[PDB]
Amino acid sequence: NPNYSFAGKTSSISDLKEVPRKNITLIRGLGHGAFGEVYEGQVSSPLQVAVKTLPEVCSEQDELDFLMEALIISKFNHQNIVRCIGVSLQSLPRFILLELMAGGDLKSFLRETRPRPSSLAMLDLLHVARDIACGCQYLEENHFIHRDIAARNCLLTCPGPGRVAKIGDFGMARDIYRAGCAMLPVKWMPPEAFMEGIFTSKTDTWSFGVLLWEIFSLGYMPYPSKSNQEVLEFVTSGGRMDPPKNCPGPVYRIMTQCWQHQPEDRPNFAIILERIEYCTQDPDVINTALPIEYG
Ligand SMILES: C=CCNS(=O)(=O)c1cccc(C(=O)Nc2nc3cc(CN4CCCCC4)ccc3n2[C@H]2CC[C@@H](CO)CC2)c1
């Protein structure tokens, strides 16, 4: 029974809301991460959920990783962080039950919803950014360092208008709480993080800058044509990404403030939200056309 502490309150497996296995039905696979497979499920107007599964063939450490993931997500309480409905850890395979996000991951969304021969506008992108910044502000307020803010780790409620973006994966924070080189999110990390292994909330500010780039580029990989080591040396020597195609100046300037070399010179998330809000109200920003991808 490992204990988990967040916002000064401690929790253990006993605090998790166990849902009887017979109340849970799987409908379809939704895809996989590195972390087993994810299904759409229903809990008994049944409740629609996402079901994250633990492989039955796994190590004792995978078991503990999965428990810790459950405790981490269960203690958050915020509209831009996916809810945990409960868990079913007393039958096999073990389940974590999460808010179903019918729009899928943000990176995939951006790539698949690129304007082609009116799907997205600048304001859609700014709303996604606001939503994630709101989730990041909540983490910062509660002294939680995420360590992997990236489009692949964000989810959307629905594909269409009204979509809300939320932070959906806490795997890196989980690994560090419980503590390879080639798996580190180098391209989202600030100098002091990959050099000294020093993480603070100004670490997540930097990563959020990179997420902003991903959003306004409509889902491109950061630092096009650069490998991890090339990015590490580029960033460490003061190198910064160029603006995404058609990116308004005021939105680019949020990215460049997020990427200040010294953590002290980076904005906190209250300031980032203020700047996103200003961009959102500015006609010259929101009237900028996104590029149309030829097809
Ligand atoms: C962001 C990482 C996933 N973290 S999670 O597995 O703990 C999680 C938590 C809460 C919800 C979800 C979830 O709903 N995932 C999910 N829903 C998907 C829906 C679709 C349907 N598409 C139809 C066409 C329009 C776009 C949506 C597709 C994939 C969906 N996923 C994925 C997210 C990425 C991976 C994560 O393992 C698989 C599950 C996933």
From Swiss-Prot:
Location of the active site: D148
Residues of the Protein kinase domain: 24-285
Phosphotyrosine, modified sites: Y4, Y39, Y177
Effect noted on mutating F76L: In NBLST3; somatic mutation; constitutively activated; retained in the endoplasmic reticulum and Golgi compartments
Binding site for ATP: H32, K52, E99, L100, M101, D169
Compartments where located: Cell membrane
PTM statement from Swiss-Prot or TrEMBL: Phosphorylated at tyrosine residues by autocatalysis, which activates kinase activity. In cells not stimulated by a ligand, receptor protein tyrosine phosphatase beta and zeta complex (PTPRB/PTPRZ1) dephosphorylates ALK at the sites in ALK that are undergoing autophosphorylation through autoactivation. N-glycosylated.
Tissue-by-tissue expression: Expressed in brain and CNS. Also expressed in the small intestine and testis, but not in normal lymphoid cells.
Effect annotated for changing A133T: In NBLST3; somatic mutation
Function according to Swiss-Prot or TrEMBL: Neuronal receptor tyrosine kinase that is essentially and transiently expressed in specific regions of the central and peripheral nervous systems and plays an important role in the genesis and differentiation of the nervous system. Also acts as a key thinness protein involved in the resistance to weight gain: in hypothalamic neurons, controls energy expenditure acting as a negative regulator of white adipose tissue lipolysis and sympathetic tone to fine-tune energy homeostasis.
Family: Belongs to the protein kinase superfamily. Tyr protein kinase family. Insulin receptor subfamily.
Involvement in disorder: A chromosomal aberration involving ALK is found in a form of non-Hodgkin lymphoma. Translocation t(2;5)(p23;q35) with NPM1. The resulting chimeric NPM1-ALK protein homodimerize and the kinase becomes constitutively activated. The constitutively active fusion proteins are responsible for 5-10% of non-Hodgkin lymphomas.
Free-text note on domains in this protein's UniProt record: The EGF-like region drives the cytokine specificity for ALKAL2.
Subunit structure and binding partners: Homodimer; homodimerizes following heparin- and ligand-binding. Interacts with CBL, IRS1, PIK3R1 and PLCG1. Interacts with FRS2 and SHC1. Interacts with PTN and MDK.
Protein name, per record: ALK tyrosine kinase receptor
Origin species: Homo sapiens
Included stretch of the parent chain: 1093 to 1402 of 1620
